Structure 1
Amino acid sequence: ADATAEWITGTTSRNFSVGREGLEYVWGNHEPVRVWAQESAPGDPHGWPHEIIIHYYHRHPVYTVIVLCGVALAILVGTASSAACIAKARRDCLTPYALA
């Protein structure tokens, strides 16, 4: 509970970060007001991949950057390894016709 207490004079504007857990604010002698944040990130998770990418990046940034990093690393490693395998097979099958 990142409790912030401030004495406020005059007409100002204050920014607070609400999560799915919720945030409760008390303003003067008023009764406490509790609010909750729901997953309303911009984009559509059901449309094109770029909209899904920006939506899930706005939802959870570290998980999204690490899963796209995993996808990129996995496809790069797979293509490199299978290119090495194809080159191995190519030169192995081309050397009996290369000695003769």
Structure 2
Amino acid sequence: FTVTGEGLEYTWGNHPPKRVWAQESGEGNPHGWPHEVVVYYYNRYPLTTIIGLCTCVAIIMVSCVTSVWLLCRTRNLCITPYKLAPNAQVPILLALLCCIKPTRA
């Protein structure tokens, strides 16, 4: 019989009823490596920590493809006013620091 922290009672035969409660022992360890943190919370909560693990990689995937849609757009505006006219001297800050494509010619 699965016993949670709320409790459970059982009567066997003509015996009086007996109640038992479940403590929060667990198996893992929360102060450690990220594989040890997830394992401890998976045993304590096997219904919430599998949703927040999928949610946290959903926001990270969304925020990564939002940023690279804005970092690559910015780098595409570094090149279009300089690659059109190759006679213009490209400044040394835009070659490596502000945008990735270096100097030439």
Q: Fold match, TM over 0.5?
A: yes
What SS is found at the alignment partner of 2:60? helix
Shift of 1:49: 1.5
1:89 to 65, 74, 90: 74
Please, what is the CA RMSD of the aligned residues? 1.1
Separation in 1 of the partners of 2:16 and 2:32? 43
Separation in 2 of the partners of 1:41 and 1:67? 19
Give the equivalent residue in structure 1 for 2:27: 42
Give the equivalent residue in structure 1 for 2:83: 98
Amino acid at match of 1:24: E
How many percent of aligned residue pairs carry the same amino acid?
53
Give the equivalent residue in structure 1 for 2:15: 30
Give the equivalent residue in structure 1 for 2:43: 58
TM value normalised by structure 1: 0.78
TM value normalised by structure 2: 0.74
Runs of 4+ more than 2 Å apart: none
Shift of 1:56: 1.2
Which deviations, in whole Å up to 9, do the C-alpha atoms of 1:10-36 show, x marking residues without a partner? xxxxxx110111011111122211101
Unaligned runs of 5+ in 2: 86-105
Q: Which structure has more helix as a fraction of its residues?
A: 1
Give the equivalent residue in structure 1 for 2:59: 74
Which deviations, in whole Å up to 9, do the C-alpha atoms of 1:18-59 show, x marking residues without a partner? 011101111112221110111222101222211111111112
Shift of 1:62: 2.3
Unaligned runs of 5+ in 1: 1-15
What SS is found at the alignment partner of 1:97? coil
Amino acid at match of 1:53: V
- How many residues align structurally? 85
